[PDB]
Design a protein around this ligand. Structure first.
Ligand SMILES: N=C(N)NCCS[C@@H](CC(=O)O)C(=O)O
Ligand SMILES: [Zn+2]
Length: 375
């Protein structure tokens, strides 16, 4: 058989694939940083009625190695239908098995979102009523960072910002954006009519095109963790973030959602700004309102997530905290799992692109209810 990762978001190093029950592979570190966890490769020429056993030998050295426990790898014969496969984790690494029904199959850490799909999403968005490309940034390697604006009423006053995938390996993030944008196509959507009569949406489908294309997990091309560059952005080292901050300064922000994915926690959740020195009772209540309304509508919960920050101990280098404090607006880091959303088990696919898309649509419903309370 032959294994390769010479394509968009591909990531893998082949050690030995001469024995179907002893396939050995290694995950490749980011272009310019030590991080790694995301993997994506294709296998071709597999024999029929044959059990194939894979091992990612260096999983123990990954960025979040403790997150491998309970994680099931994703696979697909066509690149459209993705399914989970039996996986285990021990000192030897991550292992997964499959008796392929076809001669070729792909494996990935999560259902991938290619830049080609990104182009299609942008093309689709600009064909929707009220949608325009407000601005465009440039990544370290010269790829577009589109900023889309949804404005259907020339007298609205609120600016709701949603950006995604600052960390390239968190592909569920742009899937979330696809769901959000596709909902805008609906001819008769009363909730969106109400929301857009009072607010415009500022959307950034992908914050790290270089990292995504190169199959990176954490950093942009220059090796910078974009979500640690908000306190001191650079047009040279973190142009992706520098771009967004300039646009925010000019248009204003009344809501900010930073879409991410968490390797360890098998639950969808949101991390707020309770650690901000600028945190206020107003924001405390708004965060409560958002979580409650979203939990009542989508696959979202509150018990599991990151620990809350002690008063005034937040790291302002993170987008959620920086934007929330700089603009005194409701702000959250939305986190979807690489595993499953255990509250609603669907083992066959675990968390997926489709469920990510749905969460995006349910978030829109939540914003529609809270619009009059944002300011
Ligand atoms: N409150 C913290 N420290 N993180 C939550 C926001 S995103 C976070 C997790 C993620 O990357 O998904 C990160 O930027 O590392
Ligand atoms: Zn992230």
């Amino acid at each position: 058989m032959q294994i390769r990762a010479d394509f968009d978001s591909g990531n893998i190093q082949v050690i030995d694939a001469s024995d179907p029950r002893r396939i050995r592979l290694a995950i490749r570190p980011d272009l310019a940083s030590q991080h790694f966890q995301w993997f994506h490769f294709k296998v071709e020429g597999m024999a029929p009625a044959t059990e194939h056993c894979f091992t990612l030998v260096n999983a123990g050295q990954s960025a979040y190695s403790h997150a491998w426990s309970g994680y099931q790898a994703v696979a697909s014969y066509d690149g459209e239908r993705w399914f989970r496969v039996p996986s285990q984790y021990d000192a030897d690494g991550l292992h997964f098995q499959l008796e392929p029904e076809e001669s070729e199959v792909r494996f990935a850490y999560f259902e991938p979102y290619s830049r080609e799909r990104h182009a299609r999403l942008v093309e689709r968005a600009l064909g929707i009523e009220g949608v325009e490309r407000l601005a465009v940034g440039t990544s370290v390697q010269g790829r577009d960072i589109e900023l889309l604006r949804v404005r259907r009423h020339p007298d609205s006053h609120l600016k709701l910002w949603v950006i995604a995938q600052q960390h390239p390996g968190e592909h569920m993030a742009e899937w979330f954006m696809e769901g959000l944008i596709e909902r805008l196509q609906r001819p008769d959507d009363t909730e969106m009519q109400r929301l857009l009569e009072k607010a415009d949406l500022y959307l950034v489908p992908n914050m790290n095109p270089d990292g995504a294309f190169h199959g990176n997990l954490r950093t942009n091309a220059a090796g910078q963790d974009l979500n640690r560059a908000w306190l001191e952005p650079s047009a040279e080292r973190s142009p992706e973030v520098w771009f967004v901050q300039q646009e925010m300064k000019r248009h204003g922000v009344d809501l900010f959602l930073d879409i991410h994915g968490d390797e360890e926690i098998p639950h969808v959740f949101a991390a707020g700004c309770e650690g901000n020195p600028g945190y206020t009772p107003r924001l405390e209540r708004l965060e409560q309102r958002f979580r409650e309304e979203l939990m009542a509508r989508g696959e979202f919960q509150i018990r599991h997530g990151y620990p809350r920050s002690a008063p005034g101990q937040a790291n302002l280098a993170l987008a959620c905290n920086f934007v929330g404090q700089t603009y005194d607006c409701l702000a959250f880091t939305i986190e979807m799992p690489f595993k499953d959303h255990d509250d609603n088990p669907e083992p066959g696919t675990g968390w997926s692109g489709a469920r990510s898309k749905r969460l995006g649509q349910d978030v829109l419903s939540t914003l529609a209810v809270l619009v009059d309370e944002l300011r």
